[PDB]
Structures are given as C-alpha cells and as structure tokens.
C-alpha cells in the first residue's frame, strides 16, 4: 500500500506539511531496479522514522555519452511492490522534464574529490550526482538520507555537499549488501552474461584477500595492490579498470597505510561496469 507520487509539486507539498508537523522523514534515493541493497536501507528507515520515502529516478546528468543510460533497468511496478512489503510510505517517481523543466541557469560542480578514481574515469559524473541529490534533498526535505558504502566516493562527495550547502540532513551510510556468493548487489548485474556472473564474483574474493593481508599486518599499498591485481587477472578475463588504495573519506592516494582507507575496484565487462570496495582502518 505504498503511495506512488509522480510529480515534484505533489511530493514537496506532502513533505512541507510533514516537516512543519513533528513527523521525521527518512529518504532513500535510488535509480530503480531495486535489490536488497536498496531494501536494507528502506527497512532501516522504516524502523526509525515516522515516514520513509524512496525516490526512483534515472538521472540523465550522471550518465556519460558512451555509458548505459538507454539500457538501465526500469521496472517501477516491481520496485513499488518490493517497497510496499517493506512498509515504506511513498515512492517518488518523477518525469525527467519535471525534475529538469529546462536549461539549468545555475551549475554545480565537485572539486578535488572528483579529480581521482571514478571522478577521473567518469568526467562530470559526480557533478550530475550532486546536482540531482541536492534537488532531491530540497524536494523531500529528509531528516535522514541513506546511501550505500558500495559507492564510497559518492558517499564522501554527498557528505561534502551536505556540509558545504548546510543541508539539515544526517547522512547514514550502509554496508555493502551482497549476493550469496559475495557479489555486491547492483541493478547493473543484470547486464552480466551467465559467464560474467561467475567471473564477477572474484571482485569480492579479491577484497577478502586484500582484507586478510591487511588483517595480518600488511600496510604497503603496493603489496596489497599487486596481490589483488594478480588474483583478479587469473580469475577474470575482463579488463580491470582500477585497483587502488586511498585514504577515506579524504580520497588521497596512499602508498603506506597508517589510517582509514578504502581499497576500491572497477572492472569493465561486456556492458556491465562493476565496482566494489572495502573501507578499513581507524584514522
């Protein structure tokens, strides 16, 4: 019995009334094709907030010319069903023209945090992310917004935006939800051929390896990177786009580990470009 709100105007009118009353709002922004990674955040919100809102919007601004915008899975009826069973109050599913009624007269761009890793590999991608997340925060006016550590760089950037723009929103980061074999859940996994689906499991395996090496005491980035790379290269035939060690959330490449870092991966299959990571350390 989850309500489907289709326009920005109706969504905002609902939230303004809720905000001016004492009702706490939980928000989970998504691009649809929901999986248990998304649902885990929804369940969290439903057990903590008065109302939980889930947005389903494939944001064109965060897709590059040669990426998968046209093939991105779109299944609102199912998403709506999956959300209903969790107990979420509303699913916000706006039209593209409603979100972007015309040429933007103001532009938002990410600084240094987007000059490395995914930001360097997908130029402008995060500018598109912060643009739509900023709008969604103003449309839904949540007290708590949930994001997955699956997109670690994204998380750090959204946090920076919340700080820089003074959004009265507390960001909650959830750990990576994985399939039974370890594969990090992602709507894009549907792009995987029955073969790639098997090879793709090695991203997580390689991270388990990285974790064990770190656990035993290894702190030289190059040693971990080489072991992880060597492993992947002997278990997958796809092209490995990235195997890096950066401080987190600062995003400064580390050669020797003495603080909190995240070991991230990027692998390009036929059409599915998957990513995974592990955030570890204290400082």
Ligand X SMILES: CC(C)(CO)[C@@H](O)C(=O)OP(=O)(O)OC[C@H]1O[C@@H](n2cnc3c(N)ncnc32)[C@H](O)[C@@H]1O
**How far is the CA of 222 from the CAs of 26, 227, 256, in angstroms?**
41, 9, 8
Please name the residues in contact with 164: beta carbons below 8 A apart, sequence gap of 6 or more: none
249 preceded by cis ω (within 30°)?
A: yes
The nearest distance, CB 218 to ligand X, in angstroms, is: 26
The nearest distance, CB 204 to ligand X, in angstroms, is: 10
Q: Which listed range, 11-19, 29-37, 82-90, 241-249, lies at the site for ligand X (CB under 6 A)?
A: 29-37
Distance of CA 160 to the CA centre of its chain: 15
Q: How many other β-carbons are positioned within 10 Å of the β-carbon of residue 228?
A: 23
Return the residue of 133, 228, 257, 275 that touches ligand X, per CB under 6 A: 133
Our finding on whether 30 is near ligand X (CB under 6 A) is yes
What CA–CA distance (Å, rounded) separates 15 from 21? 10
# residues near a second copy by CB under 8 A? 37
Asked if residue 80 belongs to a known ligand binding site, the reply is: no
Q: Which residues are catalytic?
A: 38
The terminus-to-terminus CA distance of the chain in angstroms comes to: 44
Our finding on whether 174 is near ligand X (CB under 6 A) is yes
Contacts 24+ apart (CB under 8 A), 218-221: 219/256, 219/257, 219/258, 220/255, 220/256, 220/257, 221/245, 221/254, 221/255, 221/256, 221/257
Q: For residue 232, count CB atoms less than 10 angstroms from its CB and return exposed for 0-12, middle for 13-18, buried for 19 or more.
A: buried
Asked if residue 185 belongs to a known ligand binding site, the reply is: yes
Asked if residue 188 belongs to a known ligand binding site, the reply is: yes
Our finding on whether 113 is near ligand X (CB under 6 A) is no
Return the residue of 185, 265, 269, 278 that touches ligand X, per CB under 6 A: 185
What CA–CA distance (Å, rounded) separates 236 from 232? 6
The nearest distance, CB 152 to a second copy, in angstroms, is: 15
Our finding on whether 148 is near ligand X (CB under 6 A) is yes
Q: Which listed range, 97-105, 171-179, 235-243, 267-275, lies at the site for a second copy (CB under 8 A)?
A: 97-105
Our finding on whether 60 is near a second copy (CB under 8 A) is no
Asked if residue 31 belongs to a known ligand binding site, the reply is: yes
Written as six digits, the tokens of 184 are: 């990090």
Q: Is 100 helix (H, G, I), strand (E, B) or coil?
A: coil
Asked if residue 149 belongs to a known ligand binding site, the reply is: yes
Asked if residue 268 belongs to a known ligand binding site, the reply is: no
Our finding on whether 256 is near a second copy (CB under 8 A) is no
What CA–CA distance (Å, rounded) separates 248 from 225? 17
Binding string, residues 129-158; x marks residues near a second copy by CB under 8 A: -x---xx--xx-x---------------x-
Pairing status of strand 51-56 against strand 90-92: parallel
Residue 37 site contact among a second copy, ligand X, none (CB < 5 to 8 Å, cut-off depends on kind): ligand X
What CA–CA distance (Å, rounded) separates 204 from 29? 25
**Using CB under 8 A as the criterion, which residues of the chain lie in contact with a second copy when the complex forms?**
8, 12, 15-16, 19-24, 101, 103-113, 130, 134-135, 138-139, 141, 157, 160-161, 163-168
Using CB under 6 A, list all residues that contact ligand X.
Answer: 29-31, 37-38, 59, 62, 129, 132-133, 147-148, 150-151, 154, 174, 176-177, 184-187
Instruction: Return binding residues for (R)-pantoate.
Output: 62, 154
Known binding-site residues equal: 31-38, 62, 148-151, 154, 177, 185-188
């Amino acid at each position: 019995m989850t309500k489907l709100i289709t326009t920005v105007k109706e969504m905002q009118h609902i939230v303004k009334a809720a905000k001016r009353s004492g009702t706490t709002i939980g928000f989970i922004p998504t691009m649809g094709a929901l999986h248990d990674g998304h649902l885990t955040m929804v369940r969290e919100s439903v057990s903590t907030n008065d109302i939980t809102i889930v947005s389903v919007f494939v944001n064109p601004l965060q897709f590059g010319p040669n990426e998968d915008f046209d093939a991105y899975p779109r299944q609102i009826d199912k998403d709506l069903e999956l959300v209903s069973e969790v107990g979420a109050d509303i699913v916000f599913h706006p039209a593209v023209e409603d979100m972007y009624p015309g040429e933007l007269g103001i532009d938002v761009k990410v600084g240094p945090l987007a000059d490395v890793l995914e930001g360097a590999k997908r130029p402008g991608h995060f500018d598109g992310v912060v643009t739509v997340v900023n709008k969604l925060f103003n449309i839904v006016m949540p007290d708590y917004a949930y994001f997955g550590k699956k997109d670690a760089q994204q998380l750090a950037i959204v946090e920076q935006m919340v700080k820089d723009f003074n959004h009265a929103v507390e960001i909650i980061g959830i750990d990576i939800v994985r399939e039974a074999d370890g594969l990090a859940k992602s709507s894009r996994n549907v792009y995987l051929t029955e073969q790639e689906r098997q090879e793709a499991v090695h991203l997580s395996k390689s991270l388990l390896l990285a974790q064990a090496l770190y656990q035993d005491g290894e702190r030289q980035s190059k040693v971990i990177i080489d072991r992880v790379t060597e492993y992947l290269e002997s278990h997958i035939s796809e092209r490995i786009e990235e195997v890096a060690v950066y401080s987190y959330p600062q995003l400064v490449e580390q050669h020797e580990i003495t603080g909190r870092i995240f070991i991230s991966l990027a692998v390009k299959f036929s059409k599915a470009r998957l990513i995974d990571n592990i955030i570890i350390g204290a400082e």
